Design a protein around this ligand. Sequence first.
Ligand SMILES: Cc1cc2nc3c(=O)[nH]c(=O)nc-3n(C[C@H](O)[C@H](O)[C@H](O)COP(=O)(O)OP(=O)(O)OC[C@H]3O[C@@H](n4cnc5c(N)ncnc54)[C@H](O)[C@@H]3O)c2cc1C
Ligand SMILES: Cc1cc2nc3c(=O)[nH]c(=O)nc-3n(C[C@H](O)[C@H](O)[C@H](O)COP(=O)(O)OP(=O)(O)OC[C@H]3O[C@@H](n4cnc5c(N)ncnc54)[C@H](O)[C@@H]3O)c2cc1C
Ligand SMILES: COC(=O)CN1C(C)=Nc2ccc(Br)cc2[C@@H]1c1ccccc1
Ligand SMILES: COC(=O)CN1C(C)=Nc2ccc(Br)cc2[C@@H]1c1ccccc1
Ligand SMILES: [Cl-]
Ligand SMILES: [Cl-]
Ligand SMILES: [Cl-]
Ligand SMILES: [Cl-]
Ligand code: NA
Ligand code: NA
Ligand code: NA
Lengths: 488, 485
Amino acid sequence: SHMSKAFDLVVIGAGSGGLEAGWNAATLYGKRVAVVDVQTSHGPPFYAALGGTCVNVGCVPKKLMVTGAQYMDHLRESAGFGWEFDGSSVKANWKKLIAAKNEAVLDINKSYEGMFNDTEGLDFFLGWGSLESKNVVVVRETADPKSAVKERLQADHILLATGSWPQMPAIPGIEHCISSNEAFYLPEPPRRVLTVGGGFISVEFAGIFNAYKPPGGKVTLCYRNNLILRGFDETIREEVTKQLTANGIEIMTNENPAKVSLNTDGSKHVTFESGKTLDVDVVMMAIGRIPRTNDLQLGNVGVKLTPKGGVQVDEFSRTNVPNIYAIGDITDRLMLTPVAINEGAALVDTVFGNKPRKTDHTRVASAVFSIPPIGTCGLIEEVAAKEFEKVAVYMSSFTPLMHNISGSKYKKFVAKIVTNHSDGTVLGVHLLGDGAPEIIQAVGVCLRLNAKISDFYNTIGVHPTSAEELCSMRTPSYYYVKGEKMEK
Amino acid sequence: SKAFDLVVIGAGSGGLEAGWNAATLYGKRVAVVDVQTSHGPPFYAALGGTCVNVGCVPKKLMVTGAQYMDHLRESAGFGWEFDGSSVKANWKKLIAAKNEAVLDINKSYEGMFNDTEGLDFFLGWGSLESKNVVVVRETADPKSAVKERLQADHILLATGSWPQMPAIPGIEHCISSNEAFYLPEPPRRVLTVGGGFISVEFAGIFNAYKPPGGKVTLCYRNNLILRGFDETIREEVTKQLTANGIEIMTNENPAKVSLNTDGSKHVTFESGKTLDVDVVMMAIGRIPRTNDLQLGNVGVKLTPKGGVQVDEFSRTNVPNIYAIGDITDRLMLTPVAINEGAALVDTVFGNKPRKTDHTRVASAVFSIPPIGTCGLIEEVAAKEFEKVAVYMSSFTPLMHNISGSKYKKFVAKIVTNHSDGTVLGVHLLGDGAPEIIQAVGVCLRLNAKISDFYNTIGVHPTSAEELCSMRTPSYYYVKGEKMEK
Ligand SMILES: Cc1cc2nc3c(=O)[nH]c(=O)nc-3n(C[C@H](O)[C@H](O)[C@H](O)COP(=O)(O)OP(=O)(O)OC[C@H]3O[C@@H](n4cnc5c(N)ncnc54)[C@H](O)[C@@H]3O)c2cc1C
Ligand SMILES: Cc1cc2nc3c(=O)[nH]c(=O)nc-3n(C[C@H](O)[C@H](O)[C@H](O)COP(=O)(O)OP(=O)(O)OC[C@H]3O[C@@H](n4cnc5c(N)ncnc54)[C@H](O)[C@@H]3O)c2cc1C
Ligand SMILES: COC(=O)CN1C(C)=Nc2ccc(Br)cc2[C@@H]1c1ccccc1
Ligand SMILES: COC(=O)CN1C(C)=Nc2ccc(Br)cc2[C@@H]1c1ccccc1
Ligand SMILES: [Cl-]
Ligand SMILES: [Cl-]
Ligand SMILES: [Cl-]
Ligand SMILES: [Cl-]
Ligand code: NA
Ligand code: NA
Ligand code: NA
């Protein structure tokens, strides 16, 4: 006999949260830390890898792809500013985009491999981790619990940071579908695609495919309810629909796939609940992400799950079992890279540092890299209204000037500030238009600072920008007093 | 004769706000005077002011059109394929395009005049006849035909500013930005003389629209362009403009310009260096526009510098004459004039004294790539506070690894008061900087601490988020001296 490798902390999942935790504990509390993940670089079969979802199959590569997409707009829009070239000569090369995105992701993988190798107290382990018991973490050959054990890891504390995975509805033909995962690796651009879901990934991939589809190509997005983007400011959801339609993407609302069968030429025949049908080369299922709890064998130690099925955790990320924590998408709060980063740091502060700290989950700034994009932070009006007696809304939506010249007149900029009209505290900011995501960041700081609308208007404009619009609104566009919209 | 509550000389940023606010929010009767109704030669500025006619609005659009130079090329990295050899930058098309945008705002501003009760527009040149009387002559010549005398309870000087033309031999062969907005064809060779934003912004505009064998040279008399801006940013913007083909001549200054028979220009510098160019633009400064105002008649006092003298409340030495905007010669910014012009009206036709706050004012340079800035630069803060800390981040973003523009570093710097952690200045370079900085302005109004920044959760992926992920200073200034203690 001989000893198992021993750690202060073992983290399952080398992603947005786990990596911040592992890093913080190794470089700032002098701890020995094990991080398990299922591949060392991006791609099939498991897509996520060293770096996590954000890095291999999320924020980073999609943003490249959305930048890739924006050139369709750019090239068209430049004629207005006098640019001339052979429009007939223009083709959008997917192969070449993917190959770019790929090796860029690979550099991030390779770069984090090197940082493990270079950081004393931080080691990586390739495989599937699970819980044999409350202080033992087994790393196995595959997700199957009968796969050969690779190593047993003795751990004082255990960090569950496995993230989330696409939710695939049980319908006939679901095997004929794909997910965000596979989208990143289509070998050639789909000609007709249907993205299923009215959420941020679907809306996003739609514009991507929209830009890179060949010939008489068509992109259809569908949503089970009236209006895409549940959770976002309601003017934005409408504007963004009209703008997605304008770039030639079509929206199916109050529609939901019920089955998919294969056509004899390999294409996809989709029947919705309503009897309706649609033929596409690809069906991208993007209807929700579910916490990834199944391979962890949490039964072995009895970690309680919420009804929705995420790892239940207190405001400090602790499970019903001492020394086991969870952060990030597996917890089913806000599914965002920076919330997982801020969650892991805080956990490590709490447990290894002198300074206990908990993640603030309100007033989190976020974006949607649609074309144009949304930038948002804080409460939307319909929520604000329920919880505050008097709520004011300030609004503005010129179609901006450059887009009068550029040809895309359909490209509005909406800006919205939602306030507690009783003292003027800004509860929420909601934007759609070019630069929206870049603008919203400091608004985050503003909110954490309890900024009042008076603080917004009293600050002096930067001209000429779209952001200056936010310091020009002084008169409310309308209100809500106890629950009810009014206007005066 | 005609007579009024408020008479405004200059239908510009400051004055048209002043006007409208007095005329609509207070029911007062108002005159506004300008020399032209729409944009362009001969007077360039016109109804709408500098910013609309020959300022922010037109340059923004032209810079937006320059950027497509960068855009068209960077599209390749993302797999866009097209015939590169068929690419032409059509200047006349952009100028025509810019001209209708500007023309339209003019027209609708004249639309606001004919729609609005008790605010009237007057064509011609304004001048102080008497402390209650404004003459509108037909031209700047103070001996020309009177068109109106306007009886003026209160008077407003908002005639803006004008390009400074140094009195060197053959100065007459140079243009300023005014003419630059109207050039019939894009120069093959251009010298922009000046280190400030107007010179820089135009440098890059001509750089994109230059015909095939062309070259944009910029000169500054001192060592580094953009005095007043963050130094890391000045040095970077310099390296990045160089990589995009614009030559920066530092430590050089024109002593004269003489005209060649083919129309071009022979620029001779103090150093004895010479360079031949198609156009010489002069953007070395902008002066108060007070020559034509006939101020002598009442003795409104100007300073040593030449701007009308004013207190915190825009008031001149002469009771009931006031001055806002560029004419006063502080912050030369459209939104500032607009703030000045409206606090004025509130402090004069209402409840509360209101003073425009000149500090911590966010601003931008629309260079390629753009700067956005707010609050103090580090050297100035090391002279007022005892422990200054500098927070720094300078990666070349990934989209630019893929793009081909590996030289496109994003710079993000926070200057702090290290004793309490108050942020005093935030300086940005890179795509988006002018948009990012706006809400930083608000922060700086709410007393933001460096920790108020790191504690806010970032939006990913954005450049902005870098402002929210700096916790350890890169270096310091201790009681004057720079170090990493
Ligand atoms: C398509 C897409 C686009 C997105 N775009 C954005 C965006 O633009 N901005 C933004 O803020 N957020 C975005 N997100 C969200 C962001 O990716 C996630 O919120 C974040 O990556 C998850 O945080 P996490 O800590 O839970 O780590 P994760 O990265 O999700 O998980 C880490 C790792 O756990 C591993 N793992 C799973 N099971 C095991 C096993 N038991 N053993 C070992 N390892 C295991 C996985 O391989 C993975 O590498 C996007 C997400 C997706 C899917
Ligand atoms: C190239 C350039 C780019 C610029 N870019 C920006 C920018 O991006 N952002 C920014 O904030 N600022 C910018 N500015 C500066 C901004 O334009 C000015 O600060 C602003 O317009 C000043 O407003 P004002 O009220 O003082 O008067 P102005 O807007 O300058 O208007 C003064 C008016 O007075 C009129 N006038 C002059 N003499 C008389 C007379 N005797 N009788 C009657 N009328 C008269 C003029 O015709 C003019 O319309 C830029 C300026 C230039 C030159
Ligand atoms: C240069 O600093 C780093 O790149 C190290 N990292 C830090 C500080 N936090 C992370 C958060 C999320 C991810 Br995904 C990656 C990091 C990286 C990192 C690299 C290697 C091992 C752990 C963390
Ligand atoms: C279209 O904007 C308006 O509602 C009227 N304006 C206001 C409120 N402020 C201005 C500040 C600077 C300038 Br330049 C222009 C305006 C316009 C305006 C237009 C015409 C006459 C007076 C004011
Ligand atoms: Cl292709
Ligand atoms: Cl759905
Ligand atoms: Cl041309
Ligand atoms: Cl100079
Ligand atoms: Na190591
Ligand atoms: Na303002
Ligand atoms: Na942060």
